[PDB]
């Protein structure tokens, strides 16, 4: 119930970050404060990664949403192996979701509004299943996340 709502809030955050990444309409409402902070911090990471891991990223292809989900889950499983969760690492999850979605679109003639939906879903599931309780204990998105990153 709380966990259900928590998953749905993570999903909306992921959707909005990935829409931002594909330069696609909000058009319903203005981003919340947490959305804006997330877009700023997660994008700085996407940028740093794509810049400084370019050689590593070039040595594989994301031909499918199926495969994006696979590479994402294995990179993420290995990242969080030590069991350490913090706000900074949580930001890297959104960012890598973004790196792959952008990889997917550059290899597709046209991905559909559906690709970014399916990616937002697997991003959200990982964050929720791996960090959802931690987020809940550390002030959630309005206090925790925003006060951490101004």
């Amino acid at each position: 119930s709380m966990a259900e709502s928590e998953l749905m809030h993570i999903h909306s955050l992921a959707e909005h970050y990935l829409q931002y990444v594909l330069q696609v309409p909000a058009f319903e409402s203005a981003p919340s404060q947490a959305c804006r902070v997330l877009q700023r911090v997660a994008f700085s990471v996407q940028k740093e990664v794509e810049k400084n891991l370019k050689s590593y990223l070039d040595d594989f292809h994301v031909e499918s949403i199926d495969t994006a989900r696979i590479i994402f889950n294995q990179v993420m499983e290995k990242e969080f192996e030590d069991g350490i969760i913090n706000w900074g690492r949580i930001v890297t999850i959104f960012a890598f979701g973004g790196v792959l979605l952008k990889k997917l679109k550059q290899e597709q003639i046209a991905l559909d509004v559906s690709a970014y939906k399916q990616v937002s879903s697997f991003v959200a599931e990982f964050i929720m299943n791996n960090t959802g309780e931690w987020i809940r204990q550390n002030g959630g998105w309005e206090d925790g996340f925003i006060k951490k990153f101004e």
Binding site: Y56, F60, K78, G88, R89, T92, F96
Partner: peptide, 24 residues
Amino acid sequence: SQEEIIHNIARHLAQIGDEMDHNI
């Protein structure tokens, strides 16, 4: 080496996340 790739990405991301978390 796919291992080497997804290993080096994972570690860089943990490193950049941990850096982010302690930034001032």
